[PDB]
Amino acid sequence: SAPKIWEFASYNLLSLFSPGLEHLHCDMKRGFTKARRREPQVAELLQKDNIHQRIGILAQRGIYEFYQTSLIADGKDAIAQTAEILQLSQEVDSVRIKVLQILENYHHNQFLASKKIIKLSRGDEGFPEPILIQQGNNTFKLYAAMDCVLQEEDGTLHIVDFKTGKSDFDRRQAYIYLLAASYIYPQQKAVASFYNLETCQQSERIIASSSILKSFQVELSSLSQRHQKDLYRYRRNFDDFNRIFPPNPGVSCRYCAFNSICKFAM
Ligand code: SF4
Numbered sequence: 711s712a713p714k715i716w717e718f719a720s721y722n723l724l725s726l727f728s729p730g731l732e733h734l735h736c737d738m739k740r741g742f743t744k745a746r747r748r749e750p751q752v753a754e755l756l757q758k759d760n761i762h763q764r765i766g767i768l769a770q771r772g773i774y775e776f777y778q779t780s781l782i783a784d785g786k787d788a789i790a791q792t793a794e795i796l797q798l799s800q801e802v803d804s805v806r807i808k809v810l811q812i813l814e815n816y817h818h819n820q821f822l823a824s825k826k827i828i829k830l831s832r833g834d835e836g837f838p839e840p841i842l843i844q845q846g847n848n849t850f851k852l853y854a855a856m857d858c859v860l861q862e863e864d865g866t867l868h869i870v871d872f873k874t875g876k877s878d879f880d881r882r883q884a885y886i887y888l889l890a891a892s893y894i895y896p897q898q899k900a901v902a903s904f905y906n907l908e909t910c911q912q913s914e915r916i917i918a919s920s921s922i923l924k925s926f927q928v929e930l931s932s933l934s935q936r937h938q939k940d941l942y943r944y945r946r947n948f949d950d951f952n953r954i955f956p957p958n959p960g961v962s963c964r965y966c967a968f969n970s971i972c973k974f975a976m
Pocket residue numbers: 736737738739742957958959960962963964966967968969972973974975976
């Protein structure tokens with residue numbers, strides 16, 4: 711007889727509240743994405759996939775497949791083999807050439823080759839299993855998908871977050887991964903870093919004391935409650951939508967799935 715826990719937090723949720731990408735932040739976008747997502751006219755705009763999402767999904771799959779085929783060399787062209795597995799010829803050509811650049815970069819810098827792989831996601835999986843956290847009088851689910859976990863010589867776990875595109879690294883995501891690792895890999899030292907598969911730019915190695923992670927857990931617990939309160943307030947009175955999820959029209963609208971239905975779209 712375990713009650714369902716509705717409260718949850720994740721980097722994705724956090725980013726929809728607190729955004730280098732602050733200019734496109736819009737709370738009304740989150741209102742559509744989370745509070746109105748079942749409305750037919752909203753659901754149909756959410757069922758369309760993005761090019762950057764596409765490049766990212768294929769990039770993760772591409773690293774996974776390149777690595778897999780490289781374990782026991784077969785003498786073949788691993789870049790061409792991986793491109794064939796990914797069916798890049800069926801993608802928009804912009805997408806193809808970016809994934810091919812990512813594969814060329816990996817071929818020249820096979821950063822997984824000699825390493826002890828704890829986790830390497832293919833990118834095709836769904837949401838991770840939740841981590842159930844009690845913080846004060848709140849219980850919430852933490853969702854954190856780790857693209858890559860390596861084990862270093864001294865036993866330290868290295869969480870690597872793969873980036874593509876022109877995005878800047880958001881170190882809050884690294885701290886989310888380090889918090890999650892304290893639950894997934896208990897009593898194991900961990901470090902986190904970012905690596906842009908396309909530009910080969912890397913962040914520093916990020917570590918977090920137990921105190922810093924505890925305080926981030928506090929912040930995520932607060933987020934989980936605020937989000938449920940936003941939803942409750944909207945469901946209690948739909949006419950409060952605009953006040954609960956205020957619009958920020960302008961630059962934000964250029965990359966918003968809901969411009970065709972939003973009353974404030976520019
Ligand atoms: S169309 Fe513009 S104002 Fe409306 S939700 Fe999207 S970004 Fe916000």
